[PDB]
């Protein structure tokens, strides 16, 4: 929904080509990668805006989404 499908799907292909040449996917899987990203990023943006708010800024900066990566146990 929030992401535009078809460039994501090709991002999914280029990142995967380097771990397996000629890999396929199910349409269900590619859209799942997409709906997981929308759900992880929607959650991480609610986190990035709490970093900003805690910082005593209105404005988010690239500091805030990394700190939000750290807050959620990085990995």
């Amino acid at each position: 929904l929030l992401i535009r499908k078809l460039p994501f799907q090709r991002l999914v292909r280029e990142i995967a080509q380097d771990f397996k040449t000629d890999l396929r996917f199910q349409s269900s899987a590619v859209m799942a990668l997409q709906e997981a990203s929308e759900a992880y990023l929607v959650g991480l943006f609610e986190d990035t805006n709490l970093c900003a708010i805690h910082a005593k800024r209105v404005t988010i900066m690239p500091k805030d989404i990394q700190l939000a990566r750290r807050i959620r146990g990085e990995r």
């Binding site: 535009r4 499908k5 078809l6 460039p7 799907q9 090709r10 999914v12 292909r13 349409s27 590619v30």
Partner: protein, 217 residues
Amino acid sequence: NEHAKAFLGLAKCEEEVDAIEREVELYRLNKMKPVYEKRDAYIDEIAEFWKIVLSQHVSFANYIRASDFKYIDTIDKIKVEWLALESEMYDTRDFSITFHFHGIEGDFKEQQVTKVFQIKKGKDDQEDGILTSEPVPIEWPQSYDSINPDLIKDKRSPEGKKKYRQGMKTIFGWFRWTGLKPGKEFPHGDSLASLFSEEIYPFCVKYYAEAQRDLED
């Protein structure tokens, strides 16, 4: 004057507006031609261009598939071309586009193809204003015979109607696109007719130079 007679005349103005709509576009078909020809004459002298520009477009996000880009990379050439000063059969508000593909050897044939496009409107019958086209014969990939609509065994199936729904969304199902089959052909296929002919050109040279860029953001 009486409303009885004034209405009759006002309707003829709404009909003269749509006759101006053809004249101001006939002047497009006449006056643009020497910068259409110049532009074409530079893309016949550039070796390859379209296999660089198209994939970068923010609206190309809407249209063409991760899997299909291996076939549209083989595009050598794309040209837009009008008919209405050469033929009575077509309106100055109608148009055609030409592609030429080098192919994949033992998979997808080397081909030149033309698709025509024509505009519809409320005209006596107030049917919704839309863009439309005719189906074109195309040589499909051999790798795509699982989703090529013409090789589906049974289109009732939970796999067969999904393989049909995939297949109709390809760039090759866009060649079969017409504008007239709700939920049964390539989605947004009219706005892909506009993208190759008009919405590409405002940015394609930004995009050509962007793929030549070695600096980093």
